[PDB]
Amino acid sequence: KKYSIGLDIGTNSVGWAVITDEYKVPSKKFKVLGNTDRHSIKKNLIGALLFDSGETAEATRLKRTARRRYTRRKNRICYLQEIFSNEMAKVDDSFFHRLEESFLVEEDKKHERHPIFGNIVDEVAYHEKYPTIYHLRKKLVDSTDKADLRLIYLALAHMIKFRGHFLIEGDLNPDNSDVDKLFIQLVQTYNQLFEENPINASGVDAKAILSARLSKSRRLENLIAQLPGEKKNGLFGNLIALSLGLTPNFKSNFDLAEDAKLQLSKDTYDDDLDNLLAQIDLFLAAKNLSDAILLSDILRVNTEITKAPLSASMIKRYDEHHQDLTLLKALVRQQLPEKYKEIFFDQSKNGYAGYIDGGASQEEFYKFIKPILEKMDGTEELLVKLNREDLLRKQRTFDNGSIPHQIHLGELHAILRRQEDFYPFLKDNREKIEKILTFRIPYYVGPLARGNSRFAWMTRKSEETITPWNFEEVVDKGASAQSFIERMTNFDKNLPNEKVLPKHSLLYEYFTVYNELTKVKYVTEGMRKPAFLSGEQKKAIVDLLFKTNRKVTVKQLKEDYFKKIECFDSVEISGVEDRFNASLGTYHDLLKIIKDKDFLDNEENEDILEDIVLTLTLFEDREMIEERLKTYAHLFDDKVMKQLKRRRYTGWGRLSRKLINGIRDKQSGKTILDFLKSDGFANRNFMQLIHDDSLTFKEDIQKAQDSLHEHIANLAGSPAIKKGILQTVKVVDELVKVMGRHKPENIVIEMARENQTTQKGQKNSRERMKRIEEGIKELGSQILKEHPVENTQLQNEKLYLYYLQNGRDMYVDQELDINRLSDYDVDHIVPQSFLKDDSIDNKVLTRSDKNRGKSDNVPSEEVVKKMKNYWRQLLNAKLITQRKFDNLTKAERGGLSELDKAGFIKRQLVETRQITKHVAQILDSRMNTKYDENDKLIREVKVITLKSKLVSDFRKDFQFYKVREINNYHHAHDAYLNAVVGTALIKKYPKLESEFVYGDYATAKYFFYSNIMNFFKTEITLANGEIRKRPLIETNGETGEIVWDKGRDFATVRKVLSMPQVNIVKKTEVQTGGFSKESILPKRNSDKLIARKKDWDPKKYGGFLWPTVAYSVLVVAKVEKGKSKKLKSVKELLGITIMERSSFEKNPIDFLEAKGYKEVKKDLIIKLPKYSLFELENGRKRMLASAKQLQKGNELALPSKYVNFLYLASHYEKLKGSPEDNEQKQLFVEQHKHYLDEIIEQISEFSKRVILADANLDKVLSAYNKHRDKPIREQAENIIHLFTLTNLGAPAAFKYFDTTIDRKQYRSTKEVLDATLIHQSITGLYETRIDLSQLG
RNA sequence: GACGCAUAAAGAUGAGACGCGUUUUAGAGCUAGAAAUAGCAAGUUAAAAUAAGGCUAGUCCGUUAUCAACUUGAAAAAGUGGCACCGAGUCGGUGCUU
DNA sequence: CGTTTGTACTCCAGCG
DNA sequence: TCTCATCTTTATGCGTC
DNA sequence: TGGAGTACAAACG
Ligand SMILES: [Mg+2]
Ligand SMILES: [Mg+2]
Ligand SMILES: [Mg+2]
Ligand SMILES: [Mg+2]
Ligand SMILES: [Mg+2]
């Protein structure tokens, strides 16, 4: 009577099987409801459930943030317009209306069809005078006469709409820079301040270093060659401070005013000026020259005296584009007359016409045009510019994202300065306009909601609307920044009302250090047995070598302490191997700032120190930190406070203040930390304390501690795993209901965990600092000696990639910059839009322009050819992996391809692990619910957690081979074998059920799980040839109960795996998501187009074209049709797309009448989600994919002998058995060649019965017959592909050796209108069969 | 099986920004021309939208999660489906029982 | 005769 | 693609229930 | 992997 349930849970399916105590799968007759004549169905209690994977909220978050950005951009433009409105009403009162309705066609426009000026001659004259907006912007910057208010508005609105990035902190001032000839002022001011007759007769300026890539090498060599100064600081050590930072941690060179360290012009440099401001401007020109150098690097404009460098560069682009276009046209006409149309008219190619008016990109145009230019003559300059990526550039290209907002701000400020004299209102609210451009909501304030958003946390001081000019006084930024962190941090698990301590808190570090130190044992010659450290010893050890060294080694412990204090000649330490995992890093960091050791050591100020660390952890805005720490300046010096505001900490711990040091034992009065610091002779650590029965901590924690859908909503994590968890729990509940509501004896969950040898684990978890160290050593570079680094810092992704590349770019042969890594970007080699892979094998650090030129592609053939040698050097140094090299060079093997698309992404394993871990405990709490007071929980249902290694070894040892492609039965079979193996193990080794059951309790651990599975085998193999002939009958041992009979139990398993009928059910899902595909299409005379705004007719404006159907509805009604119009009754499926799902559900009859259906029978409207299952003649089943396409729903039941033979013929040389076993299986393969013909006959019969892909089957048969002389291995490997013809799901495509058989989309959902509709429960055991032929 | 610490892999959730891209309109194409066309010239920019839209009207919200049928319930949710054996091509036969 | 569903084939898909 | 933050799953080492 | 759009030709009004 008693039974068990197995589960094989995946991210896209759940397999389930029910087994009795004899390992048989029971079968029952189930009643079937509905109007059909069939009354009951016999069904085996084994099957699988398939469903579409749950989607992560990442793609929704990206859309939501984009929506917010557009909403705020339109508001910026509206603010500028509201400023201009009154003065614009003087000159042109309809100007903003004409701008706003510019999209509409001529007849839809209320005003004149020329937006700016409103008349043809003025509009043409404007577009002739200022061919681009950058001409207008430069003219307004550099022209002192009164400009037109419309032109001023257009320039300002362009800058305010497209305002550049904010990654460069501080006020880069182009108006006080960009004159690279300030080097003269540099040398003069140096001569004034440094008095020992310094060199003044300068040679060539920094222009020589600007021409090539900026580098320490280039700068140093040029300065040595041209300006041999009197001191290295005067010649090199100052000019670097004007351009280049300093990496070494030691002090600077010989002091001119103070010897303290220097660096580039950071946010902390102005506070690093204490080396001169208190000691004296020479360093004032540092900012000037630095900003000149960076702005020259960004913008290739140096000679001109313009005050608009970006606009000047864009105008130079326009001029070069014009001139080179003229030259190219002339050359092509006089040298290649037959290519002129294909280059300059044919927009379907990648010529100039396809570059401008087509869709070709700059790289595609360059690749198309380079052969033509090479074979032509007189194009040397064009080739040079093309190889420099400067030929025929547009003024708005992909790489404008390196323009900081400070450049646009400089141009806007200059314009307002020029025109503020003639338009006084521009003088009045210049500040308002600049704030509109430069305002940006802090990331810690979030959406400025007023209570109606579930993403917002901002707290506002008043109800006044927030604008850039009153944001600072309406938004409570302090509380908002605190809630930003506090809304995401975990609570304490033991005390679920308490926030956790900051990971760097002094209490947390003390708890960690003492909790580790209290369990170490020392032994010596005189000691009889090792004994714990006493309270005095732990106190002395802490104050001696934990508070004076950042990390403590066993060597330090047993040399400095045990041989100097309490002298022991020699000692053995247990409980630490090489180094203490714990440290007082926060203590040392606060000691290097707070010179007062006694302040740290005092107990009374511990609250103040804790609040300081909590502030430095919560807030990272410098003014915010200063405001919070302002109350603590009366304990410290002002220099000390200036240092404190520099101490950034991140990360939060697992335990709270109250748990660690707040709750006290009633009897002793000690806290947990006090017990750790001194607990006499017991020395109980935290785990042993909170579980001690004699201490009140256990009860204090215990007393300090709805639908399943609600609980699932409670748990954190991604929403992807929720679907799988809920579906498998529903499956288990339905199985329990099916078995007379009697709970199963055992539930066996297949866990995705794994045991590894200690060597393998230590290898795979080595420090990334070591990973860099051996590689850099092997390739012999000096990067580590030039840029000292520590393992903690390498957690930064860009820094880690920098060191993995030896400080060079991976797509160009150029150096990177440690001090400017925010410029570069982390490029995905295989693009994000193609494959989800964020592993380091997929990431590369490179300049933003190269990344964005390489849009959604693998690196091009040219890039591969240039950089393959460098990639090979890195691979030899083992900095990059073979996987990374294969990703990088994928363009040499055909680029992106569907065989590369085919695989399991690495995210699926993680989601599977999370789903199984949550499902195990959910099932345990749902099943084992009968508590008791003598023992806490009565374990009614054992939830076994097997590892997949056991079942894989069972399959591979007893030749129950698994081939995924044949059908979906392998999920059900994996569930069945999980149940069998789990119950057999539990019954055979009851003492070790405390290792499998959930809730009971590494090379040795690895060997154990290998040796445990031996009792299934008749003969155990040793390396020397010895065999232990285990008996055919396996008994429990202590009890004598029989568990595994190798005679008949394998027969039962084999019989079950050959069961034809396995309940595969595919979950019917109503589609939700985007209304349609995102591509906006040009206007056409079609009704398939969707209007992208309510007033924009698609026949005139274009629109979207691939609507997503939420569900179909079966409508039986009458439609007017005929050569003379006449209502005819009709039955057909109508697709209710996502856009109008709400419109239909509001009023189905009104919606259908609007569709043109007349006299709809409201009773016969049926909702038909995706994958609704229909059965037709001969068991041909069709799942509904939409209202126009059906999916094949039948499953092929291939015999186990053929499945095993296929797995053996394929994988021919990777069976990984013994040599004799492999040879015998080989002879098996030769002696069963007829299996190929039998399998083809099987597949052909199945196709002719239910697939009905007649032409594809003919192609398959012809290909098989033509290639039947090929080797057996290749025949097997290719015949595995033919199961794409018969797989459940969508018609897809495949290939025999060379013949590619295409797809046969069943685009006819009319055959199903007279079939039987099946409503299948979650397990598929309960059905309701509606015969649609009986509806009329 | 869980927990703390150290190392590491692979992932996740929320916020703030940038750059493109597409769509319609504006930038008078000219010449011989019945001209069906052809020649020639032009080309780089801008405005607007970027899920349709929503109501609590916010510089907010709108693509994640929830869903077999039927009987119930404003809903969430719950409730309903006979057994053994012999077999086996997607489940069948037989015998029991209301 | 004049359509109109029906099949075959091809090709479509916002991104860094 | 940039910036900021928090969190999870698994593997090995040290210590525990 | 569902939609879309052309060409084609059997199939009804
Ligand atoms: Mg599995
Ligand atoms: Mg990229
Ligand atoms: Mg599976
Ligand atoms: Mg969904
Ligand atoms: Mg674990």
XYZ file of N, CA, C and O in Angstrom, chain A residues 370 374 387 810-811 859-872 885 888-892:
100
model
N 36.383 49.500 -49.038
C 37.836 49.346 -49.025
C 38.378 48.610 -50.244
O 39.415 49.039 -50.776
N 41.060 50.298 -52.777
C 42.347 49.653 -53.000
C 42.624 49.451 -54.481
O 43.734 49.733 -54.943
N 41.531 53.638 -42.795
C 42.233 52.842 -41.797
C 42.345 53.587 -40.477
O 42.629 52.978 -39.442
N 42.206 44.688 -25.836
C 42.132 43.391 -26.497
C 41.711 43.468 -27.956
O 41.837 42.465 -28.667
N 41.212 44.610 -28.419
C 40.856 44.774 -29.818
C 41.766 45.736 -30.563
O 41.720 45.772 -31.796
N 34.221 39.689 -32.609
C 35.203 40.568 -33.247
C 35.395 40.211 -34.711
O 35.434 39.039 -35.085
N 35.504 41.243 -35.541
C 35.552 41.048 -36.979
C 36.854 40.373 -37.392
O 37.799 40.248 -36.609
N 36.886 39.928 -38.649
C 38.041 39.195 -39.152
C 39.304 40.040 -39.103
O 40.389 39.528 -38.817
N 39.185 41.337 -39.380
C 40.352 42.210 -39.311
C 40.895 42.285 -37.890
O 42.108 42.187 -37.670
N 40.004 42.450 -36.912
C 40.427 42.527 -35.516
C 41.079 41.222 -35.086
O 42.110 41.219 -34.399
N 40.489 40.094 -35.480
C 41.075 38.799 -35.160
C 42.460 38.678 -35.777
O 43.418 38.262 -35.118
N 42.594 39.056 -37.047
C 43.877 38.908 -37.722
C 44.938 39.781 -37.072
O 46.110 39.394 -36.993
N 44.550 40.959 -36.592
C 45.527 41.853 -35.984
C 45.935 41.375 -34.595
O 47.114 41.446 -34.229
N 44.978 40.880 -33.804
C 45.218 40.641 -32.387
C 45.336 39.166 -32.009
O 45.433 38.855 -30.813
N 45.331 38.253 -32.981
C 45.366 36.837 -32.644
C 46.676 36.455 -31.975
O 46.696 35.602 -31.085
N 47.782 37.068 -32.393
C 49.063 36.758 -31.767
C 49.076 37.158 -30.299
O 49.574 36.413 -29.445
N 48.542 38.336 -29.982
C 48.469 38.756 -28.589
C 47.559 37.838 -27.787
O 47.870 37.486 -26.641
N 46.428 37.436 -28.368
C 45.550 36.509 -27.664
C 46.245 35.178 -27.421
O 46.041 34.546 -26.381
N 47.068 34.736 -28.369
C 47.809 33.495 -28.176
C 48.845 33.638 -27.070
O 49.063 32.705 -26.292
N 39.457 32.157 -25.842
C 40.105 32.252 -27.146
C 39.162 31.812 -28.259
O 39.124 32.426 -29.334
N 36.765 34.631 -28.832
C 37.375 35.776 -29.496
C 37.580 35.513 -30.979
O 37.324 36.389 -31.811
N 38.038 34.316 -31.335
C 38.333 34.018 -32.730
C 37.167 33.382 -33.468
O 37.396 32.689 -34.460
N 35.930 33.606 -33.022
C 34.794 32.908 -33.613
C 34.522 33.359 -35.040
O 33.832 32.654 -35.781
N 35.051 34.512 -35.450
C 34.829 34.965 -36.818
C 35.599 34.119 -37.820
O 35.245 34.083 -39.002
N 36.659 33.443 -37.376
C 37.406 32.561 -38.263
C 36.746 31.202 -38.437
O 37.170 30.438 -39.308
